[PDB]
């Protein structure tokens, strides 16, 4: 089980140092921005990363949210990335959840973070180019360990 410990305003950057942002149709993209541009483009570029206490450490359990008019939470259900219209709940029942991601440091890579889906073991958030635009996806990465799983998380209060 999980219990909400705090939230944090954050800018999530991918391996190319591009900022993650969500538009009108809950469409995640990565764009080259300065931190002031990301603050200026809030609330499309500022994520609410809610940290949770886990009854079984794996390690840092996080939900990733964004506020448009309403709040939508990043989901990994059926190995598909979507933003469901909901608030991160104070308490989650099972050891696995579509909205819970385990945030960990990437071994040997100073300050880089990796986000594993609690619902699908060995499946991580990653960034892929869709011809010109870079996009967010869920991908099995325990074998490949693609550099694209590496994210930096910067606080924005």
């Amino acid at each position, epitope marked *: 089980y999980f219990g909400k410990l705090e939230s944090k305003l954050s800018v999530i950057r991918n391996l190319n140092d591009q900022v993650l942002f969500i538009d009108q149709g809950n469409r995640p993209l990565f764009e080259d921005m300065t931190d002031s541009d990301a603050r200026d483009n809030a609330p499309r570029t500022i994520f609410i990363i809610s940290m949770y206490k886990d009854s079984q450490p794996r390690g840092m359990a996080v939900t990733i949210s964004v506020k448009a008019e309403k709040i939508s939470t990043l989901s990994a259900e059926n190995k598909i990335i979507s933003f469901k219209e909901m608030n991160p709940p104070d308490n989650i029942k099972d050891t696995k959840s579509d909205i819970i991601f385990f945030q960990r440091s990437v071994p040997g890579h100073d300050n880089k973070m990796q986000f594993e889906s609690s619902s699908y073991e060995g499946y991580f958030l990653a960034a892929e180019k*869709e011809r010109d635009l870079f996009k967010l996806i869920l*991908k*099995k990465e325990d074998e490949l360990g693609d550099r694209s799983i590496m994210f930096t998380v910067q606080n924005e209060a």
Partner: antibody
Amino acid sequence: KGPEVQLVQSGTEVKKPGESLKISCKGSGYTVTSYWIGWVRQMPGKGLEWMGFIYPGDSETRYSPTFQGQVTISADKSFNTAFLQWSSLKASDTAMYYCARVGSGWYPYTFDIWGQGTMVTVSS
Amino acid sequence: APEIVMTQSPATLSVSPGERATLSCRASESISSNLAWYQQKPGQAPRLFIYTASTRATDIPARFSGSGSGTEFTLTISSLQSEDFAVYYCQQYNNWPSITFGQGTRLEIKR
């Protein structure tokens, strides 16, 4: 042809009743391993019928209740290809068959990319 | 669980170029906003136009507009251009993988 995101299906099939058949759908320009691929049947002059999905990375399948046991869906992970097969064709299997990518991140759960279709004719 | 039945109406629509077409879609139970619209032209694969009942896909003209929630859905095509005349299918994805399509509506030129 590339580096555009696409699904390319194998050519027109003309078969006799009782023959077996396997048709293909090769994905390119994206991580084929990581998106579900669906098969859709379109009978001549009729609508779209979902037949089943396959997750290429691990070959997890989800058949429609209508098509469960009638066809086999499969994939070759290394070759980024999904397949649809019949063990014994009937004339009523005569239709256009589409493979389509299920959206993730962008357009989640919809069919965002489609192959050009494989026409199958079953006749004596 | 028994499949959600999508009902599209009318089967055919005759509308003049420059006019407005109103395509209807009905779900046999509530699907919230879990609906997509596809266009299909002769000898071609369908293409995604609308997702999540009201959001336009890639390079979909502003003239196309989707709306609805729960059980009743509508695709409105204002100022019809020649390229807009085609068959349109709706698809529910309320509890994916259990997806279903409507039987479509053919939109033909009124002259």
